[PDB]
Write a protein that binds this DNA or RNA. Sequence first.
RNA 1: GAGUC
Lengths: 50, 49, 100, 50, 51, 100, 230, 228
Amino acid sequence: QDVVLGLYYMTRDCVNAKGEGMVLTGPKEAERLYRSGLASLHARVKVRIT
Amino acid sequence: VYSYTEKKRIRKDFGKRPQVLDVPYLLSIQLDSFQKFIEQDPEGQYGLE
Amino acid sequence: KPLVGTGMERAVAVDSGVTAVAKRGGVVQYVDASRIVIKVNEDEMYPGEAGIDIYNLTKYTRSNQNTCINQMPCVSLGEPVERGDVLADGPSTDLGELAL
Amino acid sequence: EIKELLKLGDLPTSGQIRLYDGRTGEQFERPVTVGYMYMLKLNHLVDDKM
Amino acid sequence: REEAVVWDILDEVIREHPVLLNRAPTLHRLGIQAFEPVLIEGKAIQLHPLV
Amino acid sequence: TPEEKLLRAIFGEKASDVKDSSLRVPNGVSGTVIDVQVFTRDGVEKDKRALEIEEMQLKQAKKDLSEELQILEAGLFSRIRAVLVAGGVEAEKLDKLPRD
Amino acid sequence: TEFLKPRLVDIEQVSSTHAKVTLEPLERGFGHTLGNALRRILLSSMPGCAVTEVEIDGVLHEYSTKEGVQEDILEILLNLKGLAVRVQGKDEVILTLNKSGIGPVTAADITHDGDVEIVKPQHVICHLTDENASISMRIKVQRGRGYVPASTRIHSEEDERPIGRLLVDACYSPVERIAYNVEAARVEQRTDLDKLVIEMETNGTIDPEEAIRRAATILAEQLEAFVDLR
Amino acid sequence: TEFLKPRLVDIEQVSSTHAKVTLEPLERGFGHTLGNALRRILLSSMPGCAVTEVEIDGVLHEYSTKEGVQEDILEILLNLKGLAVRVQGKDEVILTLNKSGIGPVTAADITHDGDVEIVKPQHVICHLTDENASISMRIKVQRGRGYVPASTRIHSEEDERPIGRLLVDACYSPVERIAYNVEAARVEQRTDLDKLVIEMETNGTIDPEEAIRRAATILAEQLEAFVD
RNA sequence: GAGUC
């Protein structure tokens, strides 16, 4: 149910949206951006991940 | 064209068809049957008779 | 009052018979949260007895399921009513209507 | 006929509005369905059933 | 007489005491499971969504 | 038990040959005692509580039926006033004069 | 690097219940941060005055019926909790309602005491039928924050009240509906300035300005703790 | 009228970068009031210093590959956004990196410079493979607030940049991660009030604790108007 | 008499 929903929502990818083609040095920055509302979770993006 | 209680609260009917005859007094079954038990009717062979 | 009804809520209330309905209609003489006394239309009034209809209301008794049984008077004093007007409501009832 | 009423209420035709989360103040990323519904409390009381 | 010190000590006994939850029907072995219970006021019991 | 025998002696409260049978509120539930009814036996004599509550019933019965008669009476007399006012204009010395 | 200092600016009062207040200048982000914090605190921690206790004579308990009286006991109770009160210096007072004869009782019929003020004098309390019917009652009104029902006083009830006295649930928080709106604010040149727009409706009680200021203050005190101890 | 005053309890520094602080006890729903408001400012209003632009001689655009360097321009760009710096009085500072030969190029190889303090000496920047591979450049560091991408600066810039002036996304905020859990605290008898447990990750230089104090401070300054 | 799957 709800757990699924939340997870599916985040994983799903959408056309451009806010900040398509940004570049992040690691995950924590992602979250900061989302929480400031200048980045949607659905945006396709380039991240450096270990 | 409605009574005082209805004037006080008219609900907007969307019903596209007119109920012709009225919704009969639902709890009539019981009274009618029981009333038959006591019915003073010489010929009508029911209940007491 | 149920905002989204079928119209059927009026009939449900009326038939349950836990409300008080007006036998004759006319004008309300006395209103109490306990008694509703009504003076009849001279049109309808019997030349046998007086034209005074009495409704002692039942207030706050125990139902079988531990529920409360509370009647509330609906009309106000000196108000006009006709035959079959809803005078006092049972507990789950608004002005005429079923209020579950 | 229902949507017609919604117009007369000056509301959204789908009956959805953008809402703010009372915790964060973050808006919900999708407008949500609201409205008034008729509710009932059942005879089943945790009071007695404890 | 339900004193507040009563609750403090109760909590201490309840600490690391696992209690068992059961639902009907008990179909397979997981119809009964053990949890560390934690006290809440209110009359309903709270369960983990996962189970 | 022997232990209880000695102890009785020690604190010295003998306590008469009786058991507490009193009706208590079940735990978890709590509220307001709204009304109490008692049913005395026919044989045994009434309790003061018994009398005062049955006296209440008297008062209530009386008041209810008294006011029943009074309001009914007033309506009937007022109805007779409608027939005497037709073929017999008199409003100043009828009213101010007695009823029956 | 120069941080901004936002001031209290516009203070409109529409209805006795309603009031609008703008606070510029605001920078980005603080609009929303403050918007939410405000609301929370406003509702739960607004000290208000509401009816706490009641004695009506010849009435033992809430469920029975007194002749002459339109409403039920319970329903009149309900009317009175909602009635809007301004107390001066004292924390708890007892007003007298004494009225006789034909007609409806407004709050106005309550015989007026010096320090006390009734914000909504025209509030419907009870309708008086029979001419010889009159009522006397003593209604206690107290100060308090948030929501304290009568049942939580029986909760720690060392005040075992005499029977006849009827304790009332208190809706203390005077704030009935409350919201904020972060809109762009007119600085004659500065583009990066926003205003916080405070939409507010309350049951009369607390004055718009006064309310807000007291809000901010009580908030601030909590802020002391974190900043001072490391 | 009874306000609650809480006090500081637990302060576990799992590492210098990461600190968990548990705080009791808070009045009902103020857990969230305070939790969120703090979070917001923490990240998105936080003034800081760091890298804005770069000029490498013989690297006049950001997409080509110079032989010898493993990483792309693009990649090393982002590594360097993260590197942490201490300024004193000055607003605008240009640091110089000259380095040759085999090895990972580390923060230490930058010119020390008086007022400047280098925080993370160990931070890898690029890997130079053969010894013939040499790199020279100037990295510009400004003071600003929060986080501004290249796209937002290009918005209103009449300042036309030159040949191979290489703008990078500016990460001024040293605050990396911040979140709050609210478990109902239960002080003896009153159950209703709640705990605020606050997890904080920051970029090394500034200690977690000091972050806190500063946040609340900025808050308070605005509050001046409305206390009196 | 009604709850659960």
